[PDB]
Design a protein around this nucleic acid. Structure first.
Lengths: 107, 63, 131, 60, 49, 49
RNA sequence: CAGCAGGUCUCCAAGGUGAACAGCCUCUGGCAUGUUGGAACAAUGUAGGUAAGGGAAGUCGGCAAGCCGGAUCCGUAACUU
RNA sequence: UCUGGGUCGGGGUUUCGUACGUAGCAGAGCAGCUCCCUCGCUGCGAUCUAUUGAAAGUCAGCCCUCGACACAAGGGUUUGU
C-alpha cells in the first residue's frame, strides 16, 4: 500500500513546450520530479542514472516526445531523514508507444 | 453558393474560402489555400503530387 | 448609381506599372492619385479602378516628359470582392485616359477587373476579357 | 574524498591525459590513501584504475 | 447583450435577413469539409479499419 | 466562435443588389436564465437609490 | 590600483569537407561557459531574423540593411601612357 | 459530491506529404558463373510501384471521453455589533 510500484508514461512535449533550446533538457528532469510528487506523495524524488541518460540520449535540444517511466515508492530504511519515504524513479525501454496505459505492476 | 473545384489540388472550394488567380493572357485558376498557391506559381505538376485528386485519377487509387 | 465598395489598395506614389494598351507607352510612373485628400507622411496609394496621375518613363517620346491621367486596371495586391473572393492579376497595369473617361488607345491587353468596368464603362468597351 | 591528487599521478604513470584515467567510484576509500605513484601502480595491478579506451573516430 | 437606446429607422437597420449557407468547416486550421458525412464520402476508405 | 454567412442582400440602389456576399459573424452561446430575485429603485435628488 | 573582453617575443600542429595553415564537424589533449543561480517571458532595450504590394516616394546624404558572390563554358565596350 | 478534477490512453479535427521493413519480371547499366545460354542465373545499383491520403505530431492556452491509474472535508494566519 505504501511500497507500491507501477508504470507511468510521460509526454515531455506537454511539459516543455515554450522554453528555450538550451533549457529544454534541464527543465524535463525538473518536470519528471514535479510529476513524481503528484502521484507519489513523497517530496523526495531520486532520478536514476539510466533515466537521465534516456532524456539526454538525443541532446539538450531534441528531447524525446514520449517516455515510459517506472515510479517506485520505497522505505528509506537507512537514513534518518526528516522524510520517512522516498520514490525511486527508473526508465523502462519501450519500443511502440501507442495503446499503453498506466498499469499497476506487482513487485 | 456556387462551390467550385480547386485548379491545382482539386478539392471543393467553399465560397467563403479560397483565392482567385487570373494570369495575363486571360484564364483564371483557383486555390484553396497558399499551400496549393505556392506550388502552382513554381510550375509544379499536380500529377506528381501524391495528395491531389488528379494523382488518384492517374494512379487509379482509392475507389 | 455605382458605388466604390472599398478594396485593398497597394500601389503608392512612385510605382511603375506597365501599359496594357496600344498608345506606344511601356510603363507608367505613378506621381499622385486623384481623389485622395491625404494624411501626414501617408503616401497616396491606388487600387484598381481609380483615376490616377501617371507619367511615361520609357516608350513613345511624345507621351514622355509630361503628365497623363490614368486608370488602374490590374494590380498585384490581393483585394477582397464583396462576395468574398481574393483576386490578383500577377501584374500592375494601367491605361492612358483623359478626364472624361475616353481612352487615348483602342485595345486592351490582358483582363480588366470587374469593379473597374462599371465605374468606367468606356474602359470595358475595349476590354477583351473581364475579371 | 579528494581524488584530485590521485588523477594527476595516474596520468603521469599511464602516460595518458587523465581524460582516460578511470577511478573506481564504488570502492573509493582505498584510493584516497594512495597519495603517491607506486601506491597507485599497485592499484593498476589490482584493477582499481583502468585506462579508458580512445573514443572512436571512424575512417570508414 | 442589450437593446439599443436609439430609435432605429434606417433601411440598413430594418433590412430583413434571410440566411442561405452556414460555414461549419474546421477552424482548427485550413479546413475543407463542412461535416463528417461530406468528408468521409470524399475521403473514401481509410487505413484505420 | 466565429464563422461565415452566405446570404442574399436585397438593399435597393446598391451594386450588391440581387447578388450574394459572405459575411463574418460571431457565435454567442446564450443559455437560458434563472430568475432568483427582484430589486426596486427609487429616484432621489442625490441619484437613483 | 584587480582573478580587468586591454597589451605582451617565440617551438609543434591529426582526420574529413573544402584551392587553402580560409569557415564548419570530429580525434589526442583541455575545460565547466568565464565576479552567482532559481521562477516567469511585460514595456523599452542590445544582438539576430522574417515580412503580402510598391521599390529610396525616408533621410542633408541608398546611412544602415539588402543584391551579387565559388567553379566551368562563352562573351566582354568607351578610353588609354 | 450534478461525485469532481488531474494523468495516460482512445477517437474527432488538423499539420506535413506516402515512414522502416518486405516484395517486384520496374530500374541508366555494370561485375561474376557458365547450361556460352546473355530473358540464362546470381550479385552491386540514384531512383520507381504495392503495402501507403501512408508514417510522425496534435494544447503546453483545440473538442468529447466515463476506457485504465491514483488523488480528493487537507494544512497554516486573521476577522465581534
Amino acid at each position: 500500500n505504501e511500497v507500491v510500484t507501477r508504470e507511468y508514461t510521460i509526454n515531455i512535449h506537454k511539459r516543455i513546450h515554450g522554453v528555450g533550446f538550451k533549457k529544454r533538457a534541464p527543465r524535463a528532469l525538473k518536470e519528471i520530479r514535479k510529476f513524481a510528487m503528484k502521484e507519489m506523495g513523497t517530496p523526495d524524488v531520486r532520478i536514476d542514472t539510466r533515466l537521465n541518460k534516456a532524456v539526454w540520449a538525443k541532446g539538450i535540444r531534441n528531447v524525446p516526445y514520449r517516455i515510459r517511466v517506472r515510479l517506485s515508492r520505497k522505505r528509506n530504511e537507512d537514513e534518518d531523514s526528516p522524510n520517512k519515504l522516498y520514490t525511486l524513479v527508473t526508465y523502462v525501454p519501450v519500443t511502440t508507444f501507442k495503446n499503453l496505459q498506466t498499469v499497476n505492476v506487482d513487485e | 453558393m456556387k462551390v467550385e473545384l480547386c485548379s491545382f489540388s482539386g478539392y471543393k472550394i467553399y465560397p467563403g474560402h479560397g483565392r482567385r488567380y487570373a494570369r495575363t493572357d486571360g484564364k483564371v485558376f483557383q486555390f484553396l489555400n497558399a499551400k496549393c498557391e505556392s506550388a502552382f506559381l513554381s510550375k509544379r505538376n499536380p500529377r506528381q503530387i501524391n495528395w491531389t485528386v488528379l494523382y488518384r485519377r492517374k494512379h487509379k487509387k482509392g475507389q | 448609381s455605382g458605388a466604390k465598395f472599398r478594396i485593398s489598395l497597394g500601389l503608392p506614389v512612385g510605382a511603375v506599372i506597365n501599359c496594357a494598351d496600344n498608345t506606344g507607352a511601356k510603363n507608367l510612373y505613378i506621381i499622385s492619385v486623384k481623389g485622395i485628400k491625404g494624411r501626414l507622411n501617408r503616401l497616396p496609394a491606388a487600387g484598381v479602378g481609380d483615376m490616377v496621375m501617371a507619367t511615361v518613363k520609357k516608350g513613345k517620346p511624345e507621351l514622355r516628359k509630361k503628365v497623363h491621367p490614368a486608370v488602374v486596371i490590374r494590380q498585384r495586391k490581393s483585394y477582397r470582392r464583396k462576395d468574398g473572393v481574393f483576386l490578383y492579376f500577377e501584374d500592375n497595369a494601367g491605361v492612358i485616359v483623359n478626364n472624361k473617361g475616353e481612352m487615348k488607345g483602342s485595345a486592351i491587353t490582358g483582363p480588366v477587373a470587374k469593379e473597374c468596368a462599371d465605374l468606367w464603362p468606356r474602359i470595358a468597351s475595349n476590354a477583351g476579357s473581364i475579371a | 574524498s579528494m581524488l584530485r591528487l590521485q588523477k594527476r599521478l595516474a596520468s603521469s604513470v599511464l602516460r595518458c591525459g587523465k581524460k582516460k584515467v578511470w577511478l573506481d567510484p564504488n570502492e573509493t576509500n582505498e584510493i584516497a590513501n594512495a597519495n603517491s605513484r607506486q601506491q597507485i601502480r599497485k592499484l593498476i595491478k589490482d584493477g582499481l584504475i583502468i585506462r579508458k579506451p580512445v573514443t572512436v573516430h571512424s575512417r570508414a | 447583450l442589450r437593446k439599443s437606446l436609439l430609435v432605429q429607422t434606417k433601411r440598413r437597420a430594418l433590412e430583413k435577413i434571410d440566411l442561405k449557407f452556414i460555414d461549419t468547416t474546421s477552424k482548427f486550421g485550413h479546413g475543407r469539409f463542412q461535416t463528417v458525412e461530406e468528408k468521409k464520402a470524399f475521403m473514401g476508405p481509410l487505413k484505420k479499419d | 466562435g466565429m464563422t461565415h454567412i452566405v446570404r442574399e442582400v436585397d438593399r435597393p440602389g446598391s451594386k450588391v443588389n440581387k447578388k450574394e456576399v459572405v459575411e463574418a459573424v460571431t457565435i454567442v452561446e446564450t443559455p437560458p436564465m434563472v430568475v432568483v430575485g427582484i430589486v426596486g429603485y427609487v429616484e432621489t435628488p442625490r441619484g437613483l437609490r
